[PDB]
Amino acid sequence: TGSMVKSGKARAHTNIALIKYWGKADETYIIPMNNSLSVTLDRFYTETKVTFDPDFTEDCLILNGNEVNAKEKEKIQNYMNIVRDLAGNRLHARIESENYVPTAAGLASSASAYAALAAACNEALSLNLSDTDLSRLARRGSGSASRSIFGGFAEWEKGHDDLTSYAHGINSNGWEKDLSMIFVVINNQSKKVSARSGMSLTRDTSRFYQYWLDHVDEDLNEAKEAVKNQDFQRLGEVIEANGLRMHATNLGAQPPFTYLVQESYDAMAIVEQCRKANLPCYFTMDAGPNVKVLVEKKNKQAVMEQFLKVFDESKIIASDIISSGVEIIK
Ligand SMILES: O=C(O)[C@@H]1CCCN1C(=O)COP(=O)(O)OP(=O)(O)O
């Protein structure tokens, strides 16, 4: 690289919330209405290189080898303004990013993408940010990204302002190394839906939103204690119920909506069948019909074969849970 050129490249992994983030207290800084708890996936990640050069006049984003539209371009530039303000400089960057996440299959990439960008900028500009400040910076891009700074179990503390809302990793005595998540890729419409817009309609008009608020802290504690004890059934039951409560809130929105399709319900049924046949596992769903199945690694295969009795081989994708957090790479 050139003499006056500052570059950094980072790899960050996606995460799935077991206790859901859903609805914001503050829409501009992305402060959430409640804490969330997630696990960071080994298989799925984003790699992002950022290159700061004084001769650059504006930010450029290249995604999987392709230019992005003026819209995405405008968005990334506003995000980099935050970075520039944080760093006290006026350098623009060329950003080259590669998603190793099944996005076509409906897996979200925003958590890994913003965590990767935050880390790469910190590396490029030698900002020396703490994990806490990295999380805070990622959060500004996407709420769930705040958690992808960390490996294993992580929790996003909601705080009350930009300084206090951020994530931290939970030590679980290496329990994360025993667990896995199976993704059931569900046939969906290819229409353009959005978590940010969905949770906003819900958080604002849901007749069942209060019900969600009145239970989430209890769920959070229950889950955290289940983790302290490596009690899989205890964790599973509460996260499965939390997730369903989240989708319940959408049904109460004005007017109602759902991310779930009949096939999501079919996969749910198979999970309950696996349990009754002494194969512990629990499901959760995000802003779409895909069903994610939490399972102890020893039972991963056995559970998968049950899904493989009905779903296409290509639609059953398993990932382990990675122990380590965001990393700087070449
Ligand atoms: O992952 C989450 O914690 C929640 C729970 C269910 C799925 N989900 C989401 O899709 C959150 O998607 P985000 O891209 O982080 O939303 P923004 O903060 O507006 O950027």
**141 and 205, same structural domain?**
no
Helix (H, G, I), strand (E, B) or coil at 38: strand
List the residue whose alpha carbon is closest to atom 7 of ligand 1.
286
Specified resolution (Å): 2.1
Instruction: For residue 2, give Cα distances in angstroms to 5, 10, 51, 52, 316.
Output: 5, 19, 10, 10, 45
Give the DSSP H/E element, type plus range, for residue 51: strand 36-52
Report helix, strand or coil for 308: coil
Do 74 and 143 have their domain in common? yes
* 158 and 257 belong to one structural domain: no
Experimental method: X-ray
Rounded-to-integer distance, Cα 159 and Cα 151, Å = 21
For residues 258 and 175, membership in a common domain is answered with no
Q: Are 15 and 41 in contact (CB under 8 A)?
A: yes
d(Cα 224, Cα 323) in Å, to the nearest integer?
A: 17
Quickly count: other Cβ atoms within 10 Å of residue 12's Cβ.
29
Mutation to probe ligand 1, out of 21, 194, 247 (largest number of atoms < 8 A from CB): 21
Domain containing residue 230: 185-330
Q: What is the rounded distance in angstroms from the CA atom of residue 144 to the CA atom of residue 118?
A: 13
Domain check: are 3 and 56 in the same one?
A: yes
198 & 289 share domain:
yes
Q: Is 209 left (phi over 0), alpha (psi -120 to 50) or beta?
A: alpha
Residues 14 and 108 in one domain: yes
Beta strands in 139-290 (DSSP E): 153-157, 166-170, 179-184, 281-284
Quick check: 194 and 263 in contact, CB under 8 A?
Answer: no
Strand, coil or helix: 113: helix
Judged by DSSP in three states, 242 sits in helix
Q: Left (φ > 0), alpha (ψ -120 to 50) or beta: where does 101 sit?
A: beta
Same domain, residue pair 149 and 222 = no
CB 116 within 8 A of CB 80: no
Answer yes or no: do 249 and 158 share one domain.
no
Which of 184, 208, 232 is the endpoint of a domain? Answer: 184
Q: Is the CB of 224 under 6 A from ligand 1?
A: no
Q: Which two tokens stand for residue 33?
A: 């209405």
**CATH code, 324:** 3.30.70.890
Residue finishing a domain among 118, 149, 184: 184
Same domain? 269 vs 215: yes
User: Are 220 and 282 in a shared domain?
Assistant: yes
d(CA 325, CA 131): 9
| Structural domain count of the chain | 2
User: For the domain that residue 97 is a member of, what is the CATH number?
Assistant: 3.30.230.10
Residues 156 and 286 reside in one and the same domain = no
Angle, vertex CA 161, rays to CA 240 and CA 323, nearest 5: 45
Q: Which atom of ligand 1 is nearest to the CA of 110?
A: 14
User: What is the 143 CA–ligand 1 centroid distance (Å)?
Assistant: 6
195 lines ligand 1 (CB under 6 A): yes
168, 184, 200 - which closes a domain:
184
3-state per-residue secondary structure call for 214-235: HHHHHHHHHHHHHHHCCCHHHH
Instruction: Provide the sign of the torsion angle of the four alpha carbons 175, 34, 140, 143, taken in this order.
Output: positive
